């Protein structure tokens, strides 16, 4: 992305915020506080349709193509953010006694 040259924590927090903002609109609420970066998407109410939509919302967010099953491979916001960050960036006898 255009925004680069930042410490690890800065990029991680920015990507987590982006993922939370993208998933909030899909969920319906307009706040990222209700979105937890550890809860699986299934517990939040995600189904098969909306899970696709999020990818599209991410596709326009960063301009990079993503797999259609992005949510299933990374079942939390933190894992998705991490994946996005990664993609963007004598002896003889005794020694011989074992034989018997």
């Amino acid at each position: 992305d255009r925004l680069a040259g930042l410490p690890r924590a800065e990029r991680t927090a920015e990507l987590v915020r982006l993922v939370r903002t993208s998933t909030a609109t899909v969920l319906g609420h307009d706040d990222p506080k209700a979105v937890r970066a550890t809860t699986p998407f299934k517990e939040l109410g995600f189904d098969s349709l909306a899970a696709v939509r999020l990818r599209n919302l991410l596709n326009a967010a960063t301009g990079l193509r993503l797999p259609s099953t992005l949510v299933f491979d990374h079942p939390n916001a933190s894992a998705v953010a991490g994946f996005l960050d990664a993609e963007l960036g004598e002896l003889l006898e005794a020694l011989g006694r074992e034989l018997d």
Partner: protein, 900 residues
């Protein structure tokens, strides 16, 4: 010192042995020897499944009607009405309520209360064992284990049958009993485990069986799975989740991919170690090399899959067997046909196989669920079958509903290509390998690597000559026997099977049930006609024998008659058609050479310038040699006598069979007896008709043998019996013999009484290994009591035959075999056995007839003895033959469904 070198050699040998042991315990290859399946659409054999896969088609059909389902209100287009399913098509077995209760020893009530899955598992297990070329009865008492994937489906849940004192309603639905019953009926003693992990249970069972085989707990494994739906609930459940395709077709990696279509099915395979399979000579179809299991873990819900777990499974499976990604030609994927499962599986396959892959040899991808549907727990191993078939015929079947690949999967990499059409897979320099994957709802994943079997070169020593061939068929019912005969006749009618192969396969690869039949034929047309006659219902030709027996072993008694069984050409060609007979005849000729000049073989062959069959001194040695040769031929086929009984001079032959005497001593004794017999050729006359009846008419003139209640042979005297021939005039003396001047067992016997002792006073009898119940004394003696005095007593004393037969029958013997070139005492033996209490199942069989004498007649007599219970090793009659492939048992099925 020089001792060091031997230490080095022994250390190297021990290190090599240890490494070999490590390899055997870690990655020992496993061999697949046989398989069986029952699939929707009338597919009951692997060949039919292969034909269906190659042609290209589906088994989709309508809902069953005989199961008792209420199809009226079951179907509703709206996916919102409770208790209704919007889909009405799926793969169903043609006949899931048929079973042969009597074959497996199951009462009709238990069969009615038994889940259909157990019945189908029993039938398929028997068919699988028969397909491998192994006698099912041979596996009894072995260490064969059973591993099945089976789950309850709710059979008989609306029935409350109170009268269940036996408790059939409990054990008839229990999943553990599904394998316990197989182990109990087949007699196996290996571990019996019934696993259940979602729809990947069969592959988990395969992994467990491979581990058990490698450890050494079991020598064979019966692996597989079963799934039969008895209630429509399953569909209804998924109809609430909208996870079922509307049309019912499971399009794997297709454009639609709207769901999956369920189907029933039972599948089984047989597993054994490759080294032991090669040692025992079992056929090998494919080799399982490695497998791996894991868990999905923390995923996007309990039911959703996960790509990283699949990648880890694939990598672990590849690493365990020591292979590398790039040596696998094709992968049989899960391919459930869902909207998002197929993209996940394809992406995982591309990541683990597509990367660093040759651009000229893409990995072929396909699934079997596109043809037969998702067969619940038995799906996994089912896919395995396809791969095995692809390794036998040599081509990969295509995948349906592929013309529009899913846009979610990026196929631009080129590592993985779908099977749009059939691709040849002929054997070459590159070893052919394949993989099978299975993933379940719970989350367990399985990946299995299979490889083509090694090469067999010729195994071709047919030499189909005009030798006689016996065909033995057996079954547990008359209708089953007729169906088996019809099947064998149909198999033989095709002009591509040899008689020797079919005979050997019937003799050594099939079981031996109660009802038995046998046909001895030399040409294909004769065998076909005999089998058709058997299947018709009425048997007329003498070449066809039929019988019913309830036991598996009999106490065999060999009995040897005296004279009267003479016919020119005794055996004849039989001498040139049997090495054992010729060898024994030559041994007898060598033994008798130092006393005479003529040879018995010349007389038997009607050689010119040889004595005829009219003088006693030449008739008796010929009879003795023929008798001992026939006894040796009988023993060469696996029939070992438990008691020997002789009549008159035939006792001597019995002695040689008993081992009490030696061949030279017995021959010398017979020769001396015949020579002394020739001198007393002036008086004689044998006559045949109750001892008292003879005694009351014997006083005026001054009894030889007693055969039964009305069978007495009297001594020989011309004048004495000249009046006796007409004195009765009441059907007293009618049957007469030739017996020119014999007078045996007569006061004339003791006239000489000394030269016989002088000539035969040189024998060296030895203890015998078999009972020698004689006829002069109703007792069993040993060799040490058989001296020249005993033979003189036998020549003098009475030779009563009925008492010995009755004593043997009462003792416990129940199989009397007549050994002579012509049956002469079979009728008397049968009458004596019937009159005596004994047992009411004794069988009396003869030998070469006076009009037969060919090896075909001997085989017919052997078949007559066999169809009554006597065990005979038939393979000896078919040396150097290659076993063929035969159809399985023709079960007679009846409907057993628990009607609500």
């Amino acid at each position: 010192s020089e001792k060091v070198a031997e230490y080095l050699r022994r250390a190297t040998l021990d290190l090599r042995a240890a490494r070999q042991r490590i390899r055997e315990l870690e990655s020992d290859p496993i061999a697949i020897v046989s398989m069986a399946c029952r699939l929707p659409g009338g597919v009951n054999t692997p060949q039919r499944l292969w034909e269906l896969l190659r042609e290209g088609g589906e088994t989709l059909s309508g809902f069953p009607t005989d199961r008792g389902w209420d199809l009226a209100r079951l179907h509703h287009p709206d996916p919102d009405n409770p208790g209704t399913s919007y889909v009405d098509k799926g793969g169903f077995l043609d006949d899931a309520a048929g079973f042969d209760a009597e074959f497996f020893g199951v009462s009709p009530r238990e069969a009615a209360a038994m889940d259909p899955q157990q019945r189908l598992l029993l039938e398929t297990s028997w068919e699988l064992v028969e397909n491998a070329g192994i006698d099912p009865h041979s596996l009894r008492g072995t260490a064969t284990g059973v591993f099945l994937g089976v789950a309850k489906f709710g059979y008989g849940e609306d029935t409350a049958a109170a009268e269940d004192v036996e408790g059939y309603s409990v054990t008839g639905v229990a999943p553990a009993v599904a394998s316990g019953r197989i182990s109990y009926t087949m007699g196996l003693e290996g571990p019996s485990i019934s696993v259940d992990t979602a729809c990947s249970s069969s592959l988990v069972a395969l992994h467990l069986a491979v581990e058990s085989l490698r450890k050494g707990e079991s020598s064979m494994a019966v692996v597989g799975g079963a799934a039969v739906m008895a209630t429509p609930g399953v569909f209804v459940d998924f109809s609430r989740q909208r996870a079922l395709a509307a049309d019912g077709r499971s399009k794997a990696f297709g454009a639609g991919a709207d769901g999956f279509g369920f189907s029933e099915g039972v599948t089984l395979v047989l597993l054994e170690r490759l080294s032991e399979a090669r040692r025992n000579g079992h056929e090998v179809l494919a080799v399982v090399r490695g497998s791996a299991l894991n868990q999905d873990g923390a995923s996007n819900g309990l039911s959703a899959p996960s790509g990283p777990a699949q990648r880890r499974v694939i990598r672990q499976a590849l690493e365990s067997c020591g292979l590398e990604p790039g040596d696998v030609d094709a992968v049989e994927a899960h391919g459930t046909g869902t909207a998002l499962g197929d993209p996940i599986e394809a992406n995982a396959l591309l990541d683990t196989y597509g990367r660093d892959r040759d651009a000229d040899r893409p990995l072929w991808l396909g699934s079997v669920k596109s043809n037969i549907g998702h067969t619940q727990a038995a799906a996994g191993v089912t896919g395995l079958l396809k791969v095995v078939l692809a390794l036998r015929n040599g081509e990969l079947p295509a995948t349906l509903h592929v013309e529009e690949p899913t846009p979610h999967v990026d196929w631009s990499s080129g590592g993985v290509a779908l099977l749009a059409g059939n691709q040849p897979w002929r054997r070459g320099e590159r070893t052919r390998r394949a993989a099978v994957s299975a993933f379940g709802i719970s989350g367990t994943n399985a990946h299995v690597i299979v490889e083509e079997a090694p090469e067999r070169e010729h195994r071709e020593t047919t030499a189909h000559d005009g030798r006689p061939v016996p065909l033995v068929v057996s079954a547990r019912s008359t209708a089953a026997l007729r169906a088996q005969a019809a099947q064998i006749a149909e198999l033989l009618e095709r002009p591509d099977a040899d008689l020797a192969g079919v005979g050997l396969g019937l003799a050594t690869t099939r079981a031996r049930h109660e009802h038995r039949a046998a046909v001895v034929a030399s040409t294909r047309e004769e065998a076909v006609r005999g089998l058709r006659e058997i299947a018709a219902g009425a048997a007329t030709a003498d070449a066809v024998v039929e019988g019913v027996t309830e036991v598996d072993g009999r106490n065999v008694v060999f009995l040897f008659p005296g004279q009267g069984s003479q016919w020119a050409g005794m055996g004849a060609e039989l001498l040139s058609s049997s090495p054992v007979f010729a060898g024994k005849i030559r041994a007898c000729d060598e033994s008798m050479a130092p006393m005479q000049d003529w040879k018995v073989s010349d007389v038997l062959r009607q050689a010119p310038g040889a004595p005829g069959l009219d003088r006693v001194d030449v008739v008796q040695p010929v009879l003795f040699a023929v008798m001992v040769s026939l006894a040796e031929l009988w023993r060469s086929y696996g029939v070992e006598p438990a008691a020997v009984v002789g009549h008159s001079q035939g006792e001597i032959a019995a002695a040689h069979v008993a081992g009490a005497l030696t061949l030279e001593d017995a021959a010398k004794l017979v020769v001396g007896r015949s020579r002394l017999m020739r001198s007393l050729s002036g008086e004689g006359g044998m006559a045949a008709v109750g001892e008292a009846a003879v005694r009351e008419r014997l006083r005026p003139w001054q009894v030889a043998a007693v055969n039964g209640p009305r069978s007495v042979v009297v001594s020989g005297e011309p004048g004495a019996l000249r009046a006796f021939s007409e004195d009765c005039a009441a059907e007293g003396i009618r049957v007469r013999d030739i017996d020119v001047d014999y007078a045996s067992h007569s006061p004339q016997i003791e006239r000489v009484r000394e030269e016989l002792l002088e000539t035969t006073g040189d024998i060296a009898p030895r203890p015998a290994r078999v009972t020698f119940h004689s006829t002069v004394e109703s007792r069993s003696m040993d060799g040490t009591e058989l001296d020249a005095r005993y033979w003189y007593r036998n020549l003098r004393e009475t030779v009563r035959f009925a008492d010995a037969v009755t004593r043997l029958a009462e003792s416990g013997y129940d199989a009397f075999i007549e050994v002579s070139p012509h049956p002469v005492v079979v009728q008397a033996v049968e009458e004596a056995v019937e009159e005596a209490d004994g047992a009411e199942d004794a069988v009396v069989v003869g030998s070469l007839h006076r009009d037969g004498g060919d090896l075909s007649a001997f085989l017919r007599s052997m078949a007559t003895a066999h169809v009554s219970g006597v065990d005979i090793r038939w393979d000896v009659a078919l040396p150097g033959a290659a076993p063929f492939a035969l159809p399985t048992y023709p079960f007679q099925r009846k409907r057993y469904w628990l009607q609500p």
